[PDB]
């Protein structure tokens, strides 16, 4: 089933836009905030835009975008329970956590103590 990925701090939902950019929004009418979680091998997941088919990618330089390249090694995530229903979403290849900043940009950070990397996943 499609889930939403909401940063607990800003109430912003992760969005992959058709043009490949990734950002945050509070417009729950946006069809582009729905994701399909699917398995990659035994312990990782992919986070796919239901509407566009793009996978969330954290690049080595910390930028976050969408790709349909299934061979990409920067689309695999580990989900860690953070207590209180919240989870962190960590890219396995680079050790970066997904972050939604207050200005609505989305990027990666290795800093596990950052307050903008906690997500609430809802159906």
PDB file of C-alpha atoms in Angstrom:
ATOM      1  CA  UNK A   1       0.000   0.000   0.000  1.00  0.00           C
ATOM      2  CA  UNK A   2       1.010   3.643  -0.581  1.00  0.00           C
ATOM      3  CA  UNK A   3       2.440   5.445   2.446  1.00  0.00           C
ATOM      4  CA  UNK A   4       3.227   9.065   3.282  1.00  0.00           C
ATOM      5  CA  UNK A   5       6.584  10.116   4.675  1.00  0.00           C
ATOM      6  CA  UNK A   6       6.231  13.123   6.967  1.00  0.00           C
ATOM      7  CA  UNK A   7       9.040  14.960   8.713  1.00  0.00           C
ATOM      8  CA  UNK A   8       7.890  15.189  12.309  1.00  0.00           C
ATOM      9  CA  UNK A   9       9.447  18.613  12.854  1.00  0.00           C
ATOM     10  CA  UNK A  10       7.874  20.554   9.953  1.00  0.00           C
ATOM     11  CA  UNK A  11       4.837  18.491   9.078  1.00  0.00           C
ATOM     12  CA  UNK A  12       6.280  18.429   5.558  1.00  0.00           C
ATOM     13  CA  UNK A  13       5.669  15.396   3.383  1.00  0.00           C
ATOM     14  CA  UNK A  14       8.379  14.121   1.082  1.00  0.00           C
ATOM     15  CA  UNK A  15       7.561  14.686  -2.586  1.00  0.00           C
ATOM     16  CA  UNK A  16       9.196  13.460  -5.812  1.00  0.00           C
ATOM     17  CA  UNK A  17       8.312  15.803  -8.654  1.00  0.00           C
ATOM     18  CA  UNK A  18       7.958  14.655 -12.263  1.00  0.00           C
ATOM     19  CA  UNK A  19      11.081  16.660 -13.190  1.00  0.00           C
ATOM     20  CA  UNK A  20      13.189  14.527 -10.844  1.00  0.00           C
ATOM     21  CA  UNK A  21      13.558  17.057  -8.047  1.00  0.00           C
ATOM     22  CA  UNK A  22      12.664  16.111  -4.484  1.00  0.00           C
ATOM     23  CA  UNK A  23      11.319  18.561  -1.895  1.00  0.00           C
ATOM     24  CA  UNK A  24       8.839  18.887   0.963  1.00  0.00           C
ATOM     25  CA  UNK A  25       5.211  20.043   1.023  1.00  0.00           C
ATOM     26  CA  UNK A  26       2.209  20.408   3.307  1.00  0.00           C
ATOM     27  CA  UNK A  27      -0.306  20.053   0.487  1.00  0.00           C
ATOM     28  CA  UNK A  28      -1.840  16.664   1.308  1.00  0.00           C
ATOM     29  CA  UNK A  29      -3.882  16.968  -1.886  1.00  0.00           C
ATOM     30  CA  UNK A  30      -0.618  16.493  -3.755  1.00  0.00           C
ATOM     31  CA  UNK A  31      -0.639  13.099  -5.521  1.00  0.00           C
ATOM     32  CA  UNK A  32       3.172  13.240  -5.607  1.00  0.00           C
ATOM     33  CA  UNK A  33       3.541  12.607  -1.850  1.00  0.00           C
ATOM     34  CA  UNK A  34       2.479   8.934  -2.067  1.00  0.00           C
ATOM     35  CA  UNK A  35       5.181   6.244  -1.884  1.00  0.00           C
ATOM     36  CA  UNK A  36       5.397   2.501  -2.340  1.00  0.00           C
ATOM     37  CA  UNK A  37       7.861   0.780  -0.045  1.00  0.00           C
ATOM     38  CA  UNK A  38       9.365  -2.329  -1.568  1.00  0.00           C
ATOM     39  CA  UNK A  39      12.034  -4.746  -0.582  1.00  0.00           C
ATOM     40  CA  UNK A  40      15.530  -4.794  -1.958  1.00  0.00           C
ATOM     41  CA  UNK A  41      17.126  -8.131  -1.130  1.00  0.00           C
ATOM     42  CA  UNK A  42      16.696  -9.217   2.478  1.00  0.00           C
ATOM     43  CA  UNK A  43      17.031  -6.102   4.635  1.00  0.00           C
ATOM     44  CA  UNK A  44      16.822  -2.906   2.592  1.00  0.00           C
ATOM     45  CA  UNK A  45      13.948  -0.986   1.016  1.00  0.00           C
ATOM     46  CA  UNK A  46      13.334   1.191  -1.982  1.00  0.00           C
ATOM     47  CA  UNK A  47      11.094   4.266  -1.715  1.00  0.00           C
ATOM     48  CA  UNK A  48       9.196   4.707  -4.989  1.00  0.00           C
ATOM     49  CA  UNK A  49       6.887   7.539  -6.029  1.00  0.00           C
ATOM     50  CA  UNK A  50       3.575   5.844  -6.806  1.00  0.00           C
ATOM     51  CA  UNK A  51       2.602   8.475  -9.382  1.00  0.00           C
ATOM     52  CA  UNK A  52       5.863   8.802 -11.299  1.00  0.00           C
ATOM     53  CA  UNK A  53       7.699   5.523 -10.712  1.00  0.00           C
ATOM     54  CA  UNK A  54      10.821   7.380  -9.533  1.00  0.00           C
ATOM     55  CA  UNK A  55      12.939   6.025  -6.694  1.00  0.00           C
ATOM     56  CA  UNK A  56      14.329   8.295  -4.019  1.00  0.00           C
ATOM     57  CA  UNK A  57      18.107   8.651  -4.339  1.00  0.00           C
ATOM     58  CA  UNK A  58      20.671  10.230  -1.987  1.00  0.00           C
ATOM     59  CA  UNK A  59      23.758  11.102  -4.008  1.00  0.00           C
ATOM     60  CA  UNK A  60      27.275  11.063  -2.559  1.00  0.00           C
ATOM     61  CA  UNK A  61      27.341  14.878  -2.503  1.00  0.00           C
ATOM     62  CA  UNK A  62      24.251  14.998  -0.312  1.00  0.00           C
ATOM     63  CA  UNK A  63      21.760  16.032  -2.955  1.00  0.00           C
ATOM     64  CA  UNK A  64      18.504  14.088  -3.163  1.00  0.00           C
ATOM     65  CA  UNK A  65      16.683  13.412  -6.402  1.00  0.00           C
ATOM     66  CA  UNK A  66      14.535  10.848  -8.187  1.00  0.00           C
ATOM     67  CA  UNK A  67      15.648   8.197 -10.635  1.00  0.00           C
ATOM     68  CA  UNK A  68      14.107   5.338 -12.584  1.00  0.00           C
ATOM     69  CA  UNK A  69      17.501   3.688 -12.992  1.00  0.00           C
ATOM     70  CA  UNK A  70      16.940   0.397 -11.223  1.00  0.00           C
ATOM     71  CA  UNK A  71      20.703  -0.315 -11.283  1.00  0.00           C
ATOM     72  CA  UNK A  72      21.430   2.726  -9.121  1.00  0.00           C
ATOM     73  CA  UNK A  73      23.184   1.879  -5.870  1.00  0.00           C
ATOM     74  CA  UNK A  74      22.054   5.049  -4.083  1.00  0.00           C
ATOM     75  CA  UNK A  75      18.370   4.149  -3.872  1.00  0.00           C
ATOM     76  CA  UNK A  76      18.594   1.520  -1.111  1.00  0.00           C
ATOM     77  CA  UNK A  77      17.509   2.520   2.373  1.00  0.00           C
ATOM     78  CA  UNK A  78      17.587   1.053   5.832  1.00  0.00           C
ATOM     79  CA  UNK A  79      14.707   2.014   8.078  1.00  0.00           C
ATOM     80  CA  UNK A  80      15.572   2.461  11.765  1.00  0.00           C
ATOM     81  CA  UNK A  81      12.911   2.814  14.467  1.00  0.00           C
ATOM     82  CA  UNK A  82      13.591   6.058  16.342  1.00  0.00           C
ATOM     83  CA  UNK A  83      11.067   5.593  19.138  1.00  0.00           C
ATOM     84  CA  UNK A  84       7.612   7.154  19.217  1.00  0.00           C
ATOM     85  CA  UNK A  85       6.543   5.740  15.878  1.00  0.00           C
ATOM     86  CA  UNK A  86       9.244   7.761  14.114  1.00  0.00           C
ATOM     87  CA  UNK A  87      11.878   6.256  11.852  1.00  0.00           C
ATOM     88  CA  UNK A  88      15.144   7.340  10.265  1.00  0.00           C
ATOM     89  CA  UNK A  89      15.709   6.628   6.584  1.00  0.00           C
ATOM     90  CA  UNK A  90      19.380   5.902   5.951  1.00  0.00           C
ATOM     91  CA  UNK A  91      20.924   5.349   2.529  1.00  0.00           C
ATOM     92  CA  UNK A  92      23.008   2.205   2.775  1.00  0.00           C
ATOM     93  CA  UNK A  93      25.617   3.239   0.199  1.00  0.00           C
ATOM     94  CA  UNK A  94      26.612   6.578   1.780  1.00  0.00           C
ATOM     95  CA  UNK A  95      25.388   6.364   5.377  1.00  0.00           C
ATOM     96  CA  UNK A  96      23.342   9.539   4.900  1.00  0.00           C
ATOM     97  CA  UNK A  97      19.982  10.162   6.526  1.00  0.00           C
ATOM     98  CA  UNK A  98      17.172  11.762   4.550  1.00  0.00           C
ATOM     99  CA  UNK A  99      16.453  15.313   5.754  1.00  0.00           C
ATOM    100  CA  UNK A 100      13.653  17.781   5.045  1.00  0.00           C
ATOM    101  CA  UNK A 101      14.773  21.298   5.858  1.00  0.00           C
ATOM    102  CA  UNK A 102      12.406  24.028   7.028  1.00  0.00           C
ATOM    103  CA  UNK A 103      12.775  25.800   3.639  1.00  0.00           C
ATOM    104  CA  UNK A 104      11.334  22.724   1.929  1.00  0.00           C
ATOM    105  CA  UNK A 105      14.583  21.455   0.398  1.00  0.00           C
ATOM    106  CA  UNK A 106      15.454  17.776   0.808  1.00  0.00           C
ATOM    107  CA  UNK A 107      19.019  16.564   1.270  1.00  0.00           C
ATOM    108  CA  UNK A 108      21.239  14.061   3.071  1.00  0.00           C
ATOM    109  CA  UNK A 109      23.215  14.289   6.300  1.00  0.00           C
ATOM    110  CA  UNK A 110      25.446  11.876   8.194  1.00  0.00           C
ATOM    111  CA  UNK A 111      24.571  13.657  11.437  1.00  0.00           C
ATOM    112  CA  UNK A 112      22.309  11.237  13.293  1.00  0.00           C
ATOM    113  CA  UNK A 113      21.618  13.970  15.864  1.00  0.00           C
ATOM    114  CA  UNK A 114      19.965  16.285  13.303  1.00  0.00           C
ATOM    115  CA  UNK A 115      16.345  17.043  14.274  1.00  0.00           C
ATOM    116  CA  UNK A 116      14.993  17.115  10.693  1.00  0.00           C
ATOM    117  CA  UNK A 117      15.676  13.435   9.819  1.00  0.00           C
ATOM    118  CA  UNK A 118      12.809  11.863  11.838  1.00  0.00           C
ATOM    119  CA  UNK A 119       9.830  10.679   9.794  1.00  0.00           C
ATOM    120  CA  UNK A 120       6.370   9.451  10.615  1.00  0.00           C
ATOM    121  CA  UNK A 121       5.265   6.816   8.103  1.00  0.00           C
ATOM    122  CA  UNK A 122       1.493   6.654   7.608  1.00  0.00           C
ATOM    123  CA  UNK A 123      -0.761   4.599   5.269  1.00  0.00           C
TER     124      UNK A 123
END
